[PDB]
């Protein structure tokens, strides 16, 4: 309940001119008070129009400002020019930074003046520096300066925080003021004209530095931030890698004194096992070399901190190491040229001097894995393999982006990259030939996208024609079905939907065991991803062809084999100025349907071969092998306790055996912990890097500034949970900057706290960190209803596309492939489903989003005169709130701390009620209807759509299922079985869990079925209304958990809900009309 | 007369009416009021007298 005050103070700060006026708008559910609100708003508008002060009106309508709820603030300012520089000159007292132009290997990566890199405006490109975020550097400077003004007169540790941040911002502000604040355009891009005489990386460096300095609280924070901010001005390439390198060894220096053990996808059983860390001298030499590299780059504080920690190598002081690791990733992205990044990726030294025996065994293992994955569906004539083309057509929405093509629908021309629209266009023009896989050779080389992650090297992505996806979809789906129940495939293994996000490596860690872990992210152009890998897959397909008598399955396998054959001899396109390089590339890359599963298969085969060779010199049992995306790790158990020499010998043997196959591996062997891309374990504890950048983005998103503010808050929450706390006031300042909309060049509307924190499509953040927003008061229900009224919007582009003959022809072909002939009713439902699937196209979704935002803005400019009987979640909670009695309770701490970087209050919740055991899926995946849908298409209807559908008539449900692509017989079986009667409860559970973010943020870490938690909830059971009991119990759990989060203490809840109230609420529980913005989903794991 | 509300509640409690089930017991509550009781009393005595 602080956002509105901070907003008003920020408006005063940024519009300190004497002509600046803030007009606060209010709303109320009470008609008597709403009339006063309307009169107050009218009088404020009239006074501003006549230019009269509004102070007296705050006395005339002091009840409105008291009893009504603030809806927004209208700001009128007329002196906006050169305001940020006027504020900044105060903080530019320090010495500006001078870039070292001999730090980066590539010339254009040195932070020199833009003219020195792009002599003419035609040569200029901001792609190598673009923050790719819809917020300006001027806004970041304004937010930092507002924070400094607000906290200028703090005392105690607050004053120390202010002083540290003032020093860091003095650095940043002096550097920026030396050249002047560059001005963004409407697209938040920085043009050549405003960047000629500035350092090229000034804007992105300034954004990263502002984030870092606003993330500083302690002295160690200040030292790390100062070092990184000063060094990243000159270093743009190797700084993050330099700082993150030691961690891969540090995890191996901490003994385990008790640890966690994964059971099923989030369930941990805890061990009191003690394991000593066995570290050979070579590892210490490597760590010494890493620290020497740090110092050679100008680092003094970070290596000194690491050396100080190395005195004891204790897990209690390891949080500083985790802090350095997380901070390393906030020096921004490395958006080097596609040519250099690709050439780094496809830098290969292929040799004929490889071990033929090893390669033949590896190929045989790949063949065996493919056969194991696809034997049963191939032998039994699985429907998906019989209708592979139809399955691919139905699942096109889940395909990767193609290369942009000029499509025409009706009389409109578009430039979609969506493969479904490409299929539509080709069908309309007689170019749809699934049976032919286009070559990807020097005649039609593959265009390349890029995936960039801070610290990590850039990855190339194939952009293939849609025929590859059509050919590969069904086979890869069968592969994923197999891999979901295979524990070795960490990326895919899951009992229902959730992955082993904590990993499974600590179960077999012992004093007779060692864990070998290897980074394999650089094995895209390795010699083992060449002909051997593709030919192993081809041999598997050839074997599978003999196991089936269905011509359609054989044709599916033939098309998959043809895709592999074509990809064996493939070329890639890379632009370079005015010349396109066609580079031979017969290796693996993402952007193909099978890439993830195929990489897992190949890595498993390769590690099996390597371990087979390593068994020559040592006797051990391989306990587990896990291939988790960019990393692999295997646990080897020995008949003796592990010694230093054993660890060193195993590491050397693994490296040499991988080299025998021409694979360059840095084989890291430990006894106590590992470090992989998505987590690292040290001292029996698990850590996740908190490197999500806030003021910089990898690439320009297809969202709005509103949704980007929501994503900014979500990223801030995820970073905070992982141990990287940015000041919440700075985040709220950014939120108010990004959610404001210009009614005119002089008038700007700032939404209030209620607007932004309310559960709706417009939700951006929560008033309290880690607590889902809900409220039982009349105003909150009223505004939720009003916002729900604005959710439904149309798209003109979607309408024109759906009305075009191209879309109608596509729907007709889809229907005839679905065994319907001029049905006239089924076809219309299929057309609706395909029009919905068109929502993945960025212009359509953006048009809908902007329509919603515009409607919201029109509503916000006036007091909300909207009333409806529509039921929202706040209505349910208001109904059930009065019957809950609250008492003070106590829970002892009886659960282990396994995530040391969790915030203290979240950690308290975990210690008191425990961590999540098993997760109820948020999409209703384990409902009969959802399983039926997944049987034919990977398209996932939103849980809201399923919630609406499951309460319709039987024929309506049947028609919806047929539209999704389920055959009529199966849909009629589902409906006539009356299975929807049981399915509606699972659907309601998933719907409510989605609305209340039970599977997001900190809630995903909690156990909502904890015996300790349910010991605090006392709801006498009344049967035969499961929906009401479910919502009552979930609400009680949320209330208790949120109270503990906010206060750090516990409350018991008691609700003797009357039966009549239960029956009344039962009717409403199936008519809930509520939404929550997906942009507010804070996924702790990513 | 016994309170019509109290007697109706007692009859509902004795009959154990189930919302999800169609029952004959529900119709037992038809036309239970004090005016009907007085109507019956007067009708019986007056008809016997006349």
């Amino acid at each position: 309940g602080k956002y509105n005050l901070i907003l008003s103070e920020y408006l005063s700060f940024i519009y300190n001119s004497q002509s600046a006026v803030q007009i606060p708008i209010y709303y109320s559910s009470n008609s008597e008070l709403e009339n006063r609100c309307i009169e107050f708003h009218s009088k404020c508008l009239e006074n501003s129009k006549n230019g009269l002060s509004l102070k007296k009106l705050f006395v005339e309508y002091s009840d409105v400002i008291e009893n009504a709820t603030l809806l927004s603030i209208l700001s009128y300012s007329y002196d906006k020019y050169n305001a940020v520089e006027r504020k900044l000159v105060k903080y530019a007292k320090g010495k500006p930074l001078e870039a070292d132009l001999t730090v980066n290997e590539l010339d254009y990566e040195n932070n020199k003046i833009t003219s020195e890199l792009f002599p003419t405006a035609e040569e200029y490109t901001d792609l190598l520096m673009d923050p790719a975020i819809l917020t300006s550097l001027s806004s970041n400077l304004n937010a930092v300066m507002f924070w400094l003004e607000k906290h200028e007169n703090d005392v105690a540790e607050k004053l120390k925080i202010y002083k540290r941040r003032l020093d860091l911002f003095t650095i940043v502000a002096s550097t920026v003021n030396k050249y002047g604040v560059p001005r963004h355009n409407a697209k938040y891009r920085y043009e050549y004209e405003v960047m000629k005489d500035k350092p090229y990386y000034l804007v992105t460096w300034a954004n990263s530095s502002i984030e870092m300095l606003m993330s500083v609280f302690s002295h160690e924070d200040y030292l790390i931030a100062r070092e990184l901010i000063v060094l990243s001005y000159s270093n743009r390439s190797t700084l993050a890698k330099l700082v993150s390198s030691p961690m891969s060894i540090l995890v191996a220096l901490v003994d385990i004194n008790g640890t966690f053990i994964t059971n099923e996808e989030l369930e941990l059983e805890f061990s009191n096992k003690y394991v000593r860390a066995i570290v050979p001298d070579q590892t210490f030499d490597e760590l010494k070399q890493m620290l020497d590299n740090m110092r050679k780059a100008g680092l003094t504080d970070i290596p000194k901190m690491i050396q100080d920690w190395l005195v004891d190598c204790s897990i209690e002081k390891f949080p500083l190491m985790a802090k350095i690791y997380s901070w390393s990733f906030h020096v921004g992205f490395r958006k080097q040229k596609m040519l250099d990044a690709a050439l780094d990726q496809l830098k290969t030294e292929y040799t004929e001097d490889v071990d033929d025996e090893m390669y033949r065994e590896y190929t045989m293992l790949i063949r065996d894995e493919v056969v194991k994955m696809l034997e049963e569906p191939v032998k039994h004539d699985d429907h998906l393999l019989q209708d592979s083309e139809l399955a691919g057509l139905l699942s096109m929405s889940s395909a990767s982006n193609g290369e942009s093509r000029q499509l025409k629908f009706g009389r409109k021309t578009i430039f979609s990259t969506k493969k479904n629209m490409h299929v539509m266009d080709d069908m309309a023009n007689g170019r749809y030939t699934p049976g032919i896989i286009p070559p990807v050779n020097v005649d039609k080389p593959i265009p390349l996208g890029r995936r960039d992650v801070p610290g990590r090297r850039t990855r190339i992505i194939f952009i293939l024609p849609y025929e590859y996806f059509i050919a590969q979809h069904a086979v890869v789906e069968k592969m994923l079905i197999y891999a979901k129940h295979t524990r070795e495939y960490a990326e895919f293994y899951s009992q229902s939907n959730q992955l082993l996000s904590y990993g499974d490596v600590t179960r077999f860690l012992s004093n007779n065991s060692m864990v070998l872990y290897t980074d394999v992210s650089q094995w895209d152009s390795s010699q083992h991803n060449t002909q051997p890998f593709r030919k192993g897959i081809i041999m598997g397909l050839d074997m599978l062809a003999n196991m089936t008598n269905d011509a359609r399955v054989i044709q599916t396998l033939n098309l998959y084999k043809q895709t592999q054959i074509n990809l064996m001899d493939s070329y890639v396109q890379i632009p370079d100025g005015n010349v396109i390089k066609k580079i031979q590339y017969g290796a693996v890359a993402s952007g193909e349907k099978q890439t993830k599963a195929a990489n897992s298969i190949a890595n498993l085969a390769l590690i099996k071969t390597v371990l087979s060779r390593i068994s020559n010199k040592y006797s051990f049992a391989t306990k587990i092998i896990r291939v988790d995306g960019d990393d692999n790790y295997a646990v080897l158990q020995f008949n003796t306790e592990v010694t230093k020499q054993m660890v060193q010998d195993v590491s050397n043997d693994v490296r040499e055996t991988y080299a025998r196959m021409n694979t360059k591996v840095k084989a890291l062997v430990s006894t106590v912990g590992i470090e992989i891309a998505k987590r690292y374990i040290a001292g029996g504890k698990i850590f996740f890097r908190a490197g999500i950048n806030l003021l910089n983005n990898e690439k320009k998103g297809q969202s709005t500034q509103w949704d980007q503010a929501a994503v900014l808050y979500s990223n801030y929450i995820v970073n905070r949970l992982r141990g990287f706390e940015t000041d919440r006031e700075f985040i709220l300042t950014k939120i108010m900057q990004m959610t404001s909309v210009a009614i005119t060049g002089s008038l700007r509307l700032f939404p209030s706290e209620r607007v932004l924190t309310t559960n709706s499509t417009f939700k951006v953040f929560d008033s309290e960190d880690f607590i889902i927003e809900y409220g039982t008061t009349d105003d909150e229900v009223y505004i939720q209803r009003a916002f729900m009224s604005l959710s439904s919007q149309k798209s003109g582009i979607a309408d024109e596309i759906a009305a075009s003959s191209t879309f109608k022809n596509y729907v007709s072909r889809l229907s005839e492939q679905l065994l319907f002939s001029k049905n006239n009713i089924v076809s219309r439902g299929i057309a609706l489903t395909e029009k919905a699937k068109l929502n993945s196209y960025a212009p359509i979704s953006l048009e809908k989003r902007r329509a919603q935002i515009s409607a919201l803005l029109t509503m916000l400019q006036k007091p909300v005169t909207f009333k409806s009987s529509k039921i929202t979640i706040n209505d349910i909670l208001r109904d059930i709130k009065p019957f809950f009695t609250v008492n003070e309770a106590h829970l002892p701490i009886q659960y282990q701390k396994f995530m040391p970087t969790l915030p203290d209050n979240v950690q308290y919740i975990i210690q008191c009620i425990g961590s999540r055991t098993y997760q109820i899926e948020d999409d209703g995946s384990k409902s009969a209807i959802s399983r039926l849908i997944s049987k034919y298409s990977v398209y996932k209807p939103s849980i809201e759509e399923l919630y609406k559908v499951i309460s319709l008539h039987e024929n309506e449900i049947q028609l919806y299922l047929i539209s999704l692509g389920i055959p009529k017989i199966d849909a009629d079986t589902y409906v006539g079985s009356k299975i929807y009667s049981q399915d509606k409860y699972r659907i309601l559970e998933s719907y409510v869990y989605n609305l209340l973010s039970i599977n997001y943020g900190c809630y995903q870490l909690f156990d909502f079925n904890s015996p300790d938690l349910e010991k605090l909830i006392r709801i006498p059971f009344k049967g035969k209304i499961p929906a009401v009991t479910f919502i009552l119990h979930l609400y009680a759990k949320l209330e208790v958990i949120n109270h503990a989060i906010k206060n750090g203490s516990w409350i018991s809840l008691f609700c003797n809900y009357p039966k009549s109230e239960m029956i009344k609420l039962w009717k409403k529980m199936w008519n809930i009309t509520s939404l929550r913005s997906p942009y507010t989903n804070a996924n702790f794991f990513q | 007369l016994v309170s019509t509300e109290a007697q109706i509640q007692k009859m509902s409690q004795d009959l154990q009416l189930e919302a999800l089930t169609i029952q004959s017991e529900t119709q037992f509550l038809t036309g239970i009021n004090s005016q009907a009781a007085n109507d019956c009393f007067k009708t019986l005595i007056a008809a016997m007298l006349s």
Partner: peptide, 15 residues
Amino acid sequence: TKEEHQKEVQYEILQ
């Protein structure tokens, strides 16, 4: 709506 359609029936439980 389905419940709304069912309301259209002219049955009263107690006559």
